[PDB]
Design an enzyme around this catalytic site. Structure first.
Site, PDB file in Angstrom:
ATOM      1  CE1 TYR A  17     -41.873 -22.719 -14.234  1.00 34.20           C
ATOM      2  CE2 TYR A  17     -44.019 -23.666 -13.761  1.00 34.20           C
ATOM      3  CZ  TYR A  17     -43.106 -23.160 -14.662  1.00 34.20           C
ATOM      4  OH  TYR A  17     -43.428 -23.093 -15.998  1.00 34.20           O
ATOM      5  CG  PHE A  65     -51.071 -26.971 -14.131  1.00 36.77           C
ATOM      6  CD1 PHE A  65     -51.556 -26.951 -12.835  1.00 36.77           C
ATOM      7  CD2 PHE A  65     -50.427 -25.842 -14.614  1.00 36.77           C
ATOM      8  CE1 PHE A  65     -51.376 -25.841 -12.030  1.00 36.77           C
ATOM      9  CE2 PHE A  65     -50.238 -24.735 -13.811  1.00 36.77           C
ATOM     10  CZ  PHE A  65     -50.715 -24.734 -12.518  1.00 36.77           C
ATOM     11  CG  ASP A  66     -45.881 -25.355 -16.168  1.00 39.78           C
ATOM     12  OD1 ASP A  66     -45.070 -26.091 -16.767  1.00 39.78           O
ATOM     13  OD2 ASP A  66     -45.922 -24.118 -16.333  1.00 39.78           O
ATOM     14  CB  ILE A 125     -50.184 -15.212 -11.102  1.00 44.01           C
ATOM     15  CG1 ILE A 125     -49.392 -16.334 -10.428  1.00 44.01           C
ATOM     16  CG2 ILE A 125     -50.744 -15.676 -12.439  1.00 44.01           C
ATOM     17  CD1 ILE A 125     -50.188 -17.602 -10.212  1.00 44.01           C
ATOM     18  CE1 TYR A 130     -52.241 -17.134 -15.733  1.00 39.88           C
ATOM     19  CE2 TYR A 130     -52.667 -19.060 -14.374  1.00 39.88           C
ATOM     20  CZ  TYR A 130     -51.812 -18.311 -15.157  1.00 39.88           C
ATOM     21  OH  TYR A 130     -50.523 -18.741 -15.362  1.00 39.88           O
ATOM     22  CG  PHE A 185     -47.109 -22.437  -8.247  1.00 37.13           C
ATOM     23  CD1 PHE A 185     -48.306 -21.780  -8.014  1.00 37.13           C
ATOM     24  CD2 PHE A 185     -46.731 -22.687  -9.556  1.00 37.13           C
ATOM     25  CE1 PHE A 185     -49.112 -21.384  -9.065  1.00 37.13           C
ATOM     26  CE2 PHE A 185     -47.532 -22.295 -10.611  1.00 37.13           C
ATOM     27  CZ  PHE A 185     -48.724 -21.641 -10.365  1.00 37.13           C
TER      28      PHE A 185
END
Ligand SMILES: [Cl-]
Lengths: 542, 316, 774, 104
Positions: free
Chosen positions: D25, D35-36, D55, D81, D98
């Site tokens: 991902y 961020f990821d 999530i 979130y 994503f």
């Protein structure tokens, strides 16, 4: 301003090192007034930090009295060797000794004795006829720095009290500059022992000024100046305010006790961070407090941290704000979790104050030497067509998706350079308004993608044939993938400059240009009216 | 093994010829620079403690005339090795930086000062006096007064509690037994250092310890010595009155008595060094003091303990 | 827009701002802030950090900041936990424990420092993947690519380290070497490297001393590189010290087994003697009846000669091992052969060649030089903190050690609330561990009580729960053993300094520093004789302060201003009671000191016994009963706003505790029968304080007791607001110990007016319903 | 949660409850702020469907995707979130994007 500052006490504990315990012995003579004091000689006792004289007042008893009312009858005291009852022209003979002689202070116009009223350890001092058997006093001479500092304290207190309340602006400026030069730290290139001696003297003078309430006086002066300035003269006012902030910083720099005392005004100091002219001095004072005082980090709240971060947001990229935040995070090897969490939650996720960093792939563009133009009275055909075959694409070669776009670029402004650029770099076809590109899913122009539906839509993978058609008449740009038309197009763009086919890519690709004729046989039939690009070549060209 | 091989050969290696200062000079200058830094309290420095201990051990290392003369010259050479690199000024600076508070650094500083001053080294005395008069260091004498006022005397209550615990069948530790006269070695070292400042009838230091001309404050070291002598005499009188009604004296009483008499001998030697030469000012200071009361109490204890201890063969 | 990071090689303002941004990134995750480090992994990830540490065109400040950020996010917490738990050597006895040898072969040549098997209990560290979807301490890092990369970078830096090179990485030699050496040292302390990697590092440091049979130490270096080299050499010294300790423990295990076998054989021979002499058998039985430590002391003391029962072969073996240990420690020009010679020559050469301008480098160099000539002293200091355990006690010990490590990692944190809950749970997990109450010597070696005292001092306040948990831990620690009690008694002065904390809250009894100070002296006659007059005078000063002014905490809640504080005064009286009375007998010296201090400040006695205005003890108790009857005086007014403090019962409890303390200050009868003047004086003072009429009147006060209603219900009065039978026991103790019952008429009078109504009242509570009430 | 088909896969095999899904991902903000990324650390993400570890948008995208399918998932701030998003990285009430490829 205190109404009980004229009363006289015997106090013990810390009072023997302050400037309120300093008295000048002034003989009643002008010539040879620096000579030896004898037993029974008249003098006046002047308090250095107030300028008042010890006196027998009419209403009260022993009291401090103003200089304008200090006549000889009120202010006349003598030192007696015991309670057992001339003015020569020279130095005289030494009679009273420091630290050894026991002196009984006697008022002359009344004959009374300076005694203590019988009850922290704080005895009221009175004038009594008989007195006690331990009324004797021992004299101790102070240093020159203490008495000089006490007179400077009195003069500065008078000037700043009349300033708080036409106003002597030049006297205030000269006094502020002299006081800033007075609390000047020693230079770093000085010898170690001399530097330590000067640091010791500076700390003693800072303690003497703090013990007489000069920090609060400077704060009241700053508040009064802000009230006056809220309601040339303005240049002088802001210069005086800047000098006041410099004086406050010089007063508390390097002294832990002054910073610990000043930590109570943290809300005041943080609240005065909005103004442009006062920002740097407030920041310097705040950094001095945070370096020296450890409890100021405990007193820091969330609103203070948000105010400092908003100062960083509104004033620009100043690294002194970052130094203040670093000092907020740790103090002497102890980490304050609340400050760390607040800074992390209020500075990081916005991603618009700190400079960002990433690892990006390098993108290069390749073109054939086929240039198409539009001009009045020109023998240039307007419908053109070419194809690109993707032999091999390795997506996620470098943990980032592989760039691969194909389309048309105009020679007016399409000048991609390797490295940096608009956005996050990696500039290809469609990352400016001079290139129009297709990547298998989106249409790119001006570095903004638009998702466009197609039959079995996917990114450009291996064994994919992309057909690009340019109609310079309308003008319009259309694409087809594996013969299936892409349901989107570019139109209404500038036809100035020369148009050329272009492919932009990152590492991990193999592609082939087909322009028709002897330069690549088309895998699909071109649309009606669209000429292959190889016909645009000059006869004397390859 | 540890009480014999520790720091065995580091000092000759430090001064061994292969920077104008040698490594030993550099570490002494580092300690001096730390001592001169203005601080509220002398923080604990184990490095200073270890290095001052090894310096003092380096200095501290019938007979014929030639053997005694060679021993004196060897001691002079070993003390020159340290005081030509600034050790005496460092000792004075560390004593000043103590601020009158006892610590291991003060103990090693006094031991090192004794080691470089031992035998009445006139060069070390001249260097120390020149430093004290040049710098006008009143903190040295303030710290000396504070260190002298914190010296301990015989503690009869602690002795009684120790005797009760020993009578209840409890084995007393060394720290418990060292509470009756606590830090007596430090007291002997402090007054030995003060004696060695005046050794050889050095009248300049004898007059300087009484009144420090040119300094802002003046501390009379002679009167402070008399005050500690008076406190110690009162404690010894209390101990005698504890033991006056008993036929014998046990081992704990003899041990504490021997410690107290050793400290008193050092104080008497210090006072004798203060006044010999003669020093008229120190003699007049001693005459106008509380020395005579201590003399009266000591005469009482001397006479009564002489008659008491002559009658038993376990108290020779 | 974006540029290259290398374009910061000329833009000075943005470079300074980004360098201070990297410093702030290191600051916000400093000292184990794991949540912020996980948040930071979403800003600078591992690919960026690897690129930045590998890059050679980066500016020196940026390169240093990126190395520091990598260490701060991924490596700092593990290194800190390794450095905290490094002065203790906990070794279990296994088959692998015996295999540690002092020398690696028979050639008597030193092995490489840091290379070899280690038999010590060093707990590991936990890592988890920085996934923002769906946290275990530090974020995950490969740690195998990283150590290989660090070794390759160090090798490449050493190879391109000539004095003629005009493009050092970062702009200077310091910027080239210092970040790499910091990373190498951080990975060394964490134990990441294996033996071949340590061999490569040692060959890079000095290939002649650590050869198979130039370097960094024999080059002209800046002072920062010298600081890093000093840290690396100090780590090597620590490794050698740990190896010596493990070898000593292994030889001790083998020697102990041999001594056990030899003593078993000698005892079997002794018991098989048909006609053994009486004196020899008595001496042998006295030798074998010794404590095991005395047996070890007798076996090891070879100076006893014939008195030592050790055979010659075991003595020869111990002599050989002692000689080998003294040779290995360097206790008895040429090129160096051992680490000690190399370090000594390097420090001397560095100090001779230049005058060092950094104070920290002087301190590090001379500390490292001094500790090379203090090998036996350091070995002794290490052996004082060396402990040996068994296999079945390994795993729990590991858990215990982990918990202790966590507490030490909170010594440098200013009271995080999550950290506060973590510390409370860590103390709870330590108190429940079997090794905690089964191995108190191990807990004293680890210094748990000192760490908890440091935590409690750092809090002291605004965190009552942390102080309560620390005080419960310290009280249980004192209750475990007498040696733990003495160890906590060593801190009694600081316990009594902050002893006015939490005494007003009734829910914190047993959870205050005064209770810890009491528990370190409770029923220990040796320690009670070790008390000092200033400590008792401090407690009496606190008590006198309690007898003058009301409690501000109770005055804020709306309680009436009685004029004094009877709630904390009872606590100080309870501590003094524990001080003056040990094991059913009073300590005469402590009792006399306490009585003298109390009569020199009579305001400790309360308003009743102040004199010249004081009504009396019985009048005070009757007035307290009247106060308890009136809800306006007993309780605050309704509307003024877990356990209420009734004022009448508080006054009664104060006076009962005071009479209990004074009755336990009375001299024993064997002191009176010897005619000691001080005992007679103390008893006379105590008799003058309290008359017999007050005691008999208080004993004669009727009680309120539960009854049975006409509807069949039980009506129990409130025992926390009424006069209780526990308020009469100090009166009986004072009457028995101070006055005594020696006349028949007084006994019969006391029986008629005081005791018989209580006996009848207890007989009347012998119904089925009322018998089991409190 | 809208799903865009970047690269279709088999179209037959789908993840089930209690089965571990090895996916790669790339999570970024709606403004383009990454961020990821599991590909940066070269460690693919493994999670079991039905335990509600991920999530709601990520679980819905994993259930909708087939084997060997790369897709873009747009998670609304309600399922990102909520308003109590991951502090220090994800600001509250933020839309997430994503780029998920289902390796197994
Ligand atoms: Cl004046």
């Amino acid at each position: 301003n205190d109404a009980q500052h004229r009363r006289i006490f015997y106090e013990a504990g810390g009072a023997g090192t302050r400037a309120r315990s300093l008295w000048r012995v002034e003989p009643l003579r002008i010539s040879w007034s620096g000579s030896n004091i004898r037993w029974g000689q008249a003098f006046r006792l002047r308090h250095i930090t107030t300028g008042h004289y010890l006196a027998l007042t009419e209403d009260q008893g022993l009291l401090l009295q103003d200089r304008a009312k200090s006549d000889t009858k009120s202010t006349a005291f003598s030192f007696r060797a015991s309670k057992e009852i001339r003015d020569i022209e020279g130095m005289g003979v030494p009679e009273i000794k420091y630290g050894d002689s026991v002196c009984f202070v006697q008022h002359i116009a009344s004959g009374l004795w300076v005694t203590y009223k019988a009850q922290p350890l704080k005895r009221k001092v009175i004038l009594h006829q008989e007195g006690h058997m331990d009324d004797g006093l021992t004299l101790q001479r102070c240093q020159r720095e203490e008495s000089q500092a006490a007179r400077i304290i009195r003069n500065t207190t008078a000037l700043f009290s009349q300033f708080v309340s036409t106003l002597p602006i030049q006297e205030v400026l000269q006094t502020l500059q002299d006081l800033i030069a007075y609390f000047q730290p020693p230079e770093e290139e000085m010898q170690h022992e001399d530097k330590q001696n000067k640091l010791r003297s500076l700390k003693n003078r800072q303690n003497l000024f703090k013990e007489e309430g000069m920090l609060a006086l400077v704060l009241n002066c700053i508040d009064r100046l802000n009230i006056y300035n809220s309601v040339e003269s303005g240049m002088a006012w802001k210069e005086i305010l800047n000098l006041l902030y410099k004086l406050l910083a010089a007063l508390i720099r390097g002294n832990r006790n002054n910073c610990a005392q000043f930590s109570n005004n943290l809300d005041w100091l943080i609240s005065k961070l909005d103004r442009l002219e006062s920002s740097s001095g407030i920041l310097e004072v705040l950094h001095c407090i945070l370096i020296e005082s450890p409890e100021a980090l405990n007193l820091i709240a969330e609103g203070h941290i948000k105010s400092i971060i908003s100062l960083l947001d509104k004033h620009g990229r100043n690294h002194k704000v970052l130094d203040v935040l670093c000092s907020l995070c740790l103090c002497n090897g102890v980490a304050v979790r609340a400050n760390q969490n607040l800074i992390c939650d209020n500075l990081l996720p916005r991603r618009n104050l700190l400079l960002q960093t990433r690892l990006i792939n390098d993108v290069t563009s390749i073109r054939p030497n086929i240039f198409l133009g539009v001009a009045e009275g020109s023998a240039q055909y307007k419908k053109w067509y070419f194809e690109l075959i993707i032999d091999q694409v390795d997506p996620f070669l470098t943990a980032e998706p592989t760039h691969l776009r194909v389309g048309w670029a105009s020679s007016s402004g399409y000048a991609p350079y390797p490295g940096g650029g608009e956005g996050w770099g990696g500039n290809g076809v469609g990352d400016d308004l001079y290139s129009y590109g297709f990547d298998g899913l989106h249409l790119w122009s001006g570095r903004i993608p638009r998702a466009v539906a197609s039959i079995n839509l996917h990114l450009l993978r291996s064994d994919d044939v992309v057909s690009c058609c340019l109609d310079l008449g309308v003008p319009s740009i259309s694409f087809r993938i594996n013969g299936q038309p892409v349901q989107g197009m570019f139109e209404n763009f500038n036809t100035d400059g020369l148009f050329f086919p272009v492919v932009s890519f990152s590492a991990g690709v193999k592609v082939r240009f087909l322009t028709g004729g002897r330069h690549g046989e088309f895998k699909f039939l071109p649309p009606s009216g669209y000429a292959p690009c190889y016909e645009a070549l000059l006869p004397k060209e390859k | 093994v540890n009480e014999k091989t520790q720091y065995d050969r580091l000092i000759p290696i430090l001064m061994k010829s292969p920077k104008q200062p040698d490594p030993l000079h550099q570490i002494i200058l580092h300690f001096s620079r730390n001592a001169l830094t203005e601080r509220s309290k002398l923080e604990d420095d184990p490095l200073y403690t270890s290095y001052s201990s090894m310096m003092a051990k380096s200095c501290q290392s019938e007979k014929t005339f030639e053997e005694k003369e060679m021993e004196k010259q060897k001691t002079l050479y070993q003390q020159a090795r340290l005081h030509e690199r600034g050790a005496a000024e460092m000792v004075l600076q560390m004593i000043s930086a103590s601020k009158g508070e006892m610590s291991p650094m003060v103990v090693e500083t006094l031991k090192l000062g004794i080691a470089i001053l031992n035998g009445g080294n006139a060069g070390v005395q001249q260097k120390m006096l020149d430093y004290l008069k040049e710098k006008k260091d009143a903190g040295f004498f303030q710290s000396l007064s504070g260190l002298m006022q914190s010296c301990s005397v015989l503690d009869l209550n602690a002795f009684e509690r120790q005797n009760k615990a020993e009578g209840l069948g409890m084995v007393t530790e060394e720290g418990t037994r060292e509470k009756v006269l606590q830090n007596d070695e430090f007291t002997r070292d402090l007054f030995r250092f003060l004696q060695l400042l005046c050794e050889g009838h050095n009248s300049d230091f004898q007059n300087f310890l009484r009144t420090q001309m040119g300094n802002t404050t003046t501390i009379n070291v002679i009167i402070s010595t008399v005050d500690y002598l008076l406190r110690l005499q009162e404690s010894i009188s209390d101990f005698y009155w504890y033991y006056s009604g008993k036929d014998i004296i046990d081992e704990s009483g003899q041990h504490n008595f021997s410690k107290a008499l050793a400290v008193t001998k050092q104080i008497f030697n210090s006072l004798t060094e203060y006044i010999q030469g003669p020093c008229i000012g120190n003699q007049q200071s001693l005459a106008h003091s509380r020395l005579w009361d201590a003399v009266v109490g000591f005469l009482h204890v001397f006479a009564n303990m002489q008659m008491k201890l002559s009658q038993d063969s376990s108290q020779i | 827009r974006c540029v290259d990071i290398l374009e910061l090689c000329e833009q000075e303002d943005l470079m300074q701002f980004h360098y201070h941004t990297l410093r702030l990134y290191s600051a916000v995750c400093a000292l184990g802030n794991s949540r912020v480090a996980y948040a930071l992994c979403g800003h600078v990830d591992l690919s960026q950090l690897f690129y930045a540490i590998d890059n050679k065109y980066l500016p020196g400040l940026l390169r240093s900041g990126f190395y520091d950020l990598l260490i701060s996010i991924h490596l700092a917490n593990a290194k800190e936990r390794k450095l905290m738990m490094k002065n203790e050597y906990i070794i279990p006895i296994t088959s692998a424990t015996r295999k540690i040898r002092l020398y690696p072969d028979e050639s008597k040549r030193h092995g490489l420092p840091g290379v070899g098997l280690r038999t010590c209990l060093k707990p590991g560290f936990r890592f988890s993947t920085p996934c923002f979807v769906v946290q275990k301490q530090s974020p995950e890092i490969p740690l195998e690519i990283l150590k290989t990369k660090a070794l390759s970078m160090l090798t490449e830096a050493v190879q391109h380290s000539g004095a003629h090179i005009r493009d050092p990485v970062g702009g200077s030699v310091e910027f080239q070497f210092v970040p790499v050496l910091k990373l190498i040292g951080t990975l060394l302390v964490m134990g990441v490297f294996d033996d071949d990697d340590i061999r490569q590092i040692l060959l890079l440091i000095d290939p002649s001393v650590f050869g198979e049979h130039k370097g960094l130490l024999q080059t002209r270096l800046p002072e920062s590189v010298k600081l890093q080299m000093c840290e690396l050499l100090s780590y090597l010294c620590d490794c050698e010290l740990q190896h010596r300790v493990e070898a000593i423990v292994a030889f001790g295990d083998i020697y102990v087994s041999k001594l056990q076998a030899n003593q078993k054989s000698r005892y079997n021979e002794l018991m098989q003697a048909l006609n053994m002499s009486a004196a020899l058998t008595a001496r042998k039985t006295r030798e074998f009846r010794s404590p095991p430590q005395e047996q070890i002391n007798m076996l090891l003391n070879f100076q006893l000669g014939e008195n030592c029962p050790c055979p010659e072969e075991i003595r020869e073996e111990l002599y050989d091992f002692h000689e080998d240990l003294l040779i290995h420690c360097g206790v008895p020009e040429r090129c160096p052969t051992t680490l000690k010679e190399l370090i000594s020559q390097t420090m001397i050469r560095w100090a001779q060649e230049d005058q060092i301008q950094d104070a920290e480098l002087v301190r590090m160099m001379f500390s490292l030089l001094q500790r090379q000539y203090d090998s036996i002293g350091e070995l002794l200091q290490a052996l004082r903190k060396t402990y040996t355990i068994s296999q079945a006690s390994v795993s729990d010990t590991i858990n215990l050690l982990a918990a202790l490590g966590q507490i030490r990692c909170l010594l440098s944190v200013r009271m995080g609330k999550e950290e506060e809950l973590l510390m409370i749970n860590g103390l709870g997990d330590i108190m429940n561990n079997k090794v905690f109450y089964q191995h108190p010597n191990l807990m004293r070696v680890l210094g748990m009580h000192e760490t908890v005292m440091e935590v409690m001092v750092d809090v002291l306040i605004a965190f009552p729960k942390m102080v309560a948990s620390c005080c419960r831990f310290l009280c249980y620690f004192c209750r475990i053993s007498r040696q733990n009690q003495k160890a906590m008694f060593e801190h009694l002065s600081y316990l009594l300094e902050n002893s006015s904390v939490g005494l007003a809250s009734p829910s914190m009894r047993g959870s205050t520093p005064l209770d810890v100070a009491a528990s370190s002296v409770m029923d220990n006659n040796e320690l009670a004789l070790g008390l000092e007059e200033p400590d008792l005078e401090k407690v009496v000063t606190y008590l006198a302060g309690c007898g003058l002014q009301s409690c501000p905490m109770l005055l804020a809640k709306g309680y009436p201003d009685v004029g004094w504080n009877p709630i904390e005064g009872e606590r100080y009286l309870s501590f003094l009671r524990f001080a003056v009375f040990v094991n059913s007998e009073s300590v005469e010296e402590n009792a006399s000191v306490v009585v003298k201090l109390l009569i020199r400040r009579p305001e400790c006695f309360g308003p009743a016994l102040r004199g010249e205005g004081g009504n009396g003890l019985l009048a005070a108790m009757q007035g307290a009963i009247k106060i308890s009857e009136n809800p306006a005086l007993d309780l605050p007014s309704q509307g003024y706003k877990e356990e209420i403090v009734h004022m009448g019962n508080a006054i009664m409890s104060f006076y009962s505790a005071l009479i209990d303390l004074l009755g336990r200050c009375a001299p024993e009868m064997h002191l009176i029968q010897t005619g000691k003047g001080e005992a007679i004086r103390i008893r006379s003072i105590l008799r003058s304080l309290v008359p017999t009429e007050d005691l008999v009147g208080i004993i004669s006060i009727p009680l309120k007791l539960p009854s049975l209603n006409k509807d069949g219900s039980i009506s129990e009065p409130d025992m926390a607001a009424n006069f209780c039978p526990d308020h009469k026991a100090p009166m009986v103790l004072f009457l028995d110990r101070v006055y005594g019952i020696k006349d028949q008429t007084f006994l019969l009078h006391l029986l008629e007016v005081g005791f018989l109504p209580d006996l009848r009242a207890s007989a009347s509570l012998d119904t089925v319903s009322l018998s089991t009430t409190e | 949660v809208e799903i865009e088909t970047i690269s279709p896969g088999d179209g037959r095999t789908f993840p089930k409850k209690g089965q571990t899904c090895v996916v790669h991902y790339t999570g970024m903000l709606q403004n383009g702020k990454k961020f990821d990324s599991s590909r940066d650390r070269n460690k693919p993400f493994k999670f079991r469907i039905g335990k509600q570890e991920v999530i709601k948008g990520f679980e819905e995208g994993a259930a909708q995707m087939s084997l060997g399918q790369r897709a873009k998932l747009t998670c609304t701030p309600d399922v990102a979130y909520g308003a109590t998003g991951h502090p220090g990285v994800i600001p509250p009430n933020a839309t997430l994007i994503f780029d998920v490829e289902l390796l197994n």
